[PDB]
Enzyme design. Structure first.
Site, PDB file in Angstrom:
ATOM      1  N   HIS C  43       0.780  -1.236   0.000  1.00  0.00           N
ATOM      2  CA  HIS C  43       0.000   0.000   0.000  1.00  0.00           C
ATOM      3  C   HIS C  43       0.812   1.286   0.000  1.00  0.00           C
ATOM      4  O   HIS C  43       0.272   2.339  -0.297  1.00  0.00           O
ATOM      5  CB  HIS C  43      -1.037   0.011   1.112  1.00  0.00           C
ATOM      6  CG  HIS C  43      -0.599   0.623   2.418  1.00  0.00           C
ATOM      7  ND1 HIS C  43      -0.432  -0.139   3.553  1.00  0.00           N
ATOM      8  CD2 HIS C  43      -0.479   1.913   2.807  1.00  0.00           C
ATOM      9  CE1 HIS C  43      -0.129   0.660   4.573  1.00  0.00           C
ATOM     10  NE2 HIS C  43      -0.131   1.917   4.143  1.00  0.00           N
ATOM     11  N   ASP C  99      -0.399  -7.353   2.431  1.00  0.00           N
ATOM     12  CA  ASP C  99       0.147  -6.002   2.256  1.00  0.00           C
ATOM     13  C   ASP C  99       1.698  -6.108   2.253  1.00  0.00           C
ATOM     14  O   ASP C  99       2.351  -5.932   3.277  1.00  0.00           O
ATOM     15  CB  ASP C  99      -0.312  -5.035   3.349  1.00  0.00           C
ATOM     16  CG  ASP C  99      -0.084  -3.573   3.000  1.00  0.00           C
ATOM     17  OD1 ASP C  99       0.352  -3.241   1.837  1.00  0.00           O
ATOM     18  OD2 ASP C  99      -0.406  -2.742   3.899  1.00  0.00           O
ATOM     19  N   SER C 198       4.391   3.018   7.677  1.00  0.00           N
ATOM     20  CA  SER C 198       3.963   1.821   6.925  1.00  0.00           C
ATOM     21  C   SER C 198       5.101   1.321   6.079  1.00  0.00           C
ATOM     22  O   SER C 198       5.900   2.140   5.571  1.00  0.00           O
ATOM     23  CB  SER C 198       2.770   2.124   6.031  1.00  0.00           C
ATOM     24  OG  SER C 198       1.585   2.215   6.761  1.00  0.00           O
TER      25      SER C 198
HETATM   26  C1  LIG Z   1      -3.921   2.198   3.068  1.00  0.00           C
HETATM   27  O1  LIG Z   1      -3.174   2.243   4.312  1.00  0.00           O
HETATM   28  C2  LIG Z   1      -3.882   2.430   5.527  1.00  0.00           C
HETATM   29  C3  LIG Z   1      -5.274   2.412   5.683  1.00  0.00           C
HETATM   30  C4  LIG Z   1      -5.861   2.660   6.904  1.00  0.00           C
HETATM   31  C5  LIG Z   1      -7.388   2.646   6.971  1.00  0.00           C
HETATM   32  O2  LIG Z   1      -7.925   3.701   7.347  1.00  0.00           O
HETATM   33  N1  LIG Z   1      -8.094   1.586   6.446  1.00  0.00           N
HETATM   34  C6  LIG Z   1      -7.463   0.283   6.081  1.00  0.00           C
HETATM   35  C7  LIG Z   1      -8.203  -0.920   6.701  1.00  0.00           C
HETATM   36  C8  LIG Z   1      -7.831  -2.264   6.139  1.00  0.00           C
HETATM   37  O3  LIG Z   1      -9.554  -0.740   6.282  1.00  0.00           O
HETATM   38  C9  LIG Z   1     -10.109   0.348   6.908  1.00  0.00           C
HETATM   39  C10 LIG Z   1      -9.566   1.639   6.330  1.00  0.00           C
HETATM   40  C11 LIG Z   1      -9.988   1.880   4.868  1.00  0.00           C
HETATM   41  C12 LIG Z   1      -9.794   3.418   4.605  1.00  0.00           C
HETATM   42  O4  LIG Z   1      -9.358   3.456   3.237  1.00  0.00           O
HETATM   43  C13 LIG Z   1      -5.042   2.899   8.052  1.00  0.00           C
HETATM   44  C14 LIG Z   1      -3.664   2.910   7.909  1.00  0.00           C
HETATM   45  N2  LIG Z   1      -2.642   3.079   8.763  1.00  0.00           N
HETATM   46  C15 LIG Z   1      -1.532   3.008   8.046  1.00  0.00           C
HETATM   47  N3  LIG Z   1      -0.328   3.111   8.470  1.00  0.00           N
HETATM   48  C16 LIG Z   1      -0.032   3.603   9.804  1.00  0.00           C
HETATM   49  C17 LIG Z   1       1.495   3.827   9.850  1.00  0.00           C
HETATM   50  C18 LIG Z   1      -0.295   2.659  10.936  1.00  0.00           C
HETATM   51  C19 LIG Z   1      -0.811   3.192  12.073  1.00  0.00           C
HETATM   52  C20 LIG Z   1      -0.940   2.388  13.176  1.00  0.00           C
HETATM   53  C21 LIG Z   1      -0.579   1.046  13.188  1.00  0.00           C
HETATM   54  C22 LIG Z   1      -0.064   0.508  12.011  1.00  0.00           C
HETATM   55 CL1  LIG Z   1       0.471  -1.133  12.007  1.00  0.00          CL
HETATM   56  C23 LIG Z   1       0.107   1.358  10.915  1.00  0.00           C
HETATM   57  O5  LIG Z   1      -1.758   2.711   6.773  1.00  0.00           O
HETATM   58  C24 LIG Z   1      -3.118   2.686   6.653  1.00  0.00           C
END
Ligand SMILES: COc1cc(C(=O)N2C[C@H](C)OC[C@@H]2CCO)cc2nc(N[C@H](C)c3cccc(Cl)c3)oc12
Ligand SMILES: *[C@@H]1O[C@H](CO)[C@@H](O)[C@H](O)[C@H]1NC(C)=O
EC number: 3.4.21.5
Lengths: 27, 11, 250
Positions: C43, C99, C198
């Protein structure tokens, strides 16, 4: 063959400040 | 300009 | 990284910064697994809901870094990308299942005090270490809280969480290719990844052979460091057949 061994730590037998917290969790 | 410039060879 | 601390010098010599060429910005974390291969979250490169579609030529790989923004002359190395490989069953639509992506560099990186690969686990490593309560380490240059940015690489240690707890924390469907980690609200310690982390590594130090292994890839969370939420990480060992397939083919 040398993966995962840090030149500034494992290679010189120095520990970082928190790797013990990891070890203590591996019960 | 948060990031410092890189040598030009890498770009 | 929320509620972490400054990394020590050379503490995470496998840490890679994915750096966007234009605009010049932090794209994501990554990790060095050999002199020519870097591992990250898919991603970080491809996520259509946020209009993310980066190609090889859009970014650089910066290895050996400590400071977020400085050009660390004679310490960091900057590499160009030959090719990107995204897992073909990466599920960006539903839940970020698988991912994971590999990047091949154009030229081998030279190893140094600051630059060194992490190990990938085999089945026995995974079975030994991927246990609820066992702690791993997450590192990155991402945001310091949900809603600023660190001067240097941040580190936090976080416990693996029981699968039912992980599932019960979210409405998203969690797969066997994911694990979660973080403290519970009662535990009185905190910490998480956050925007920009990420693709970076979740590592554990084997007590059997004293090497670091990359067990996870920072994938996603619902906000950062929220009480009752956790971080979801790509299970590296579950995707290792794919990793070996790509590296063996290319
Ligand atoms: C497309 O990448 C991301 C998406 C989301 C998200 O809001 N979603 C995806 C999830 C599978 O579905 C719900 C909804 C869809 C919104 O598009 C949250 C995200 N957080 C990150 N990275 C940050 C660093 C993070 C923060 C805390 C813990 C970890 Cl391990 C990582 O990347 C994200
Ligand atoms: C991303 O870009 C590549 C080439 O630039 C293209 O072939 C691919 O279909 C794109 N994918 C998208 C927009 O989902």
């Amino acid at each position: 063959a040398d993966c995962g061994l840090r030149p500034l730590f494992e290679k010189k037998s120095l520990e970082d400040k928190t790797e013990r917290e990891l070890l203590e969790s591996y019960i | 300009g948060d990031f410092e410039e890189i040598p030009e060879e890498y770009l | 990284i929320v509620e972490g601390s400054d990394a020590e010098i050379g503490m995470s010599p496998w840490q890679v910064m994915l750096f966007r060429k234009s605009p010049q910005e932090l794209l994501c974390g990554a990790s060095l697994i050999s002199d020519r291969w870097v591992l990250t979250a898919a991603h970080c490169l491809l996520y259509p809901p946020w209009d993310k579609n980066f190609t090889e030529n859009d970014l650089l790989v910066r290895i050996g870094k400590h400071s977020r923004t400085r050009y660390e002359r004679n310490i960091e190395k900057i590499s160009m990308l030959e090719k990107i490989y995204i897992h073909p069953r990466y599920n960006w639509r539903e839940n970020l299942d698988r991912d994971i992506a590999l990047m091949k560099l154009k030229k081998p990186v030279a190893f140094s005090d600051y630059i060194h690969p992490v190990c990938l686990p085999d089945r026995e490593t995974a079975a030994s270490l991927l246990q609820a309560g066992y702690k791993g380490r997450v590192t990155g240059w991402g945001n310091l809280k949900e809603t600023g940015q660190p001067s240097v690489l941040q580190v936090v240690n976080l416990p693996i969480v029981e699968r039912p707890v992980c599932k019960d924390s979210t409405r998203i469907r969690i797969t066997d290719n994911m694990f979660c980690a973080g403290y519970k609200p009662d535990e009185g310690k905190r910490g998480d990844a956050c925007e920009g982390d990420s693709g970076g590594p979740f590592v554990m130090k084997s007590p059997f052979n004293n090497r670091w292994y990359q067990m996870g890839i920072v994938s996603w969370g619902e906000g950062c460091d929220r009480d009752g939420k956790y971080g979801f990480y790509t299970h590296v060992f579950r995707l290792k057949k794919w990793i070996q397939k790509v590296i063996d083919q290319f």
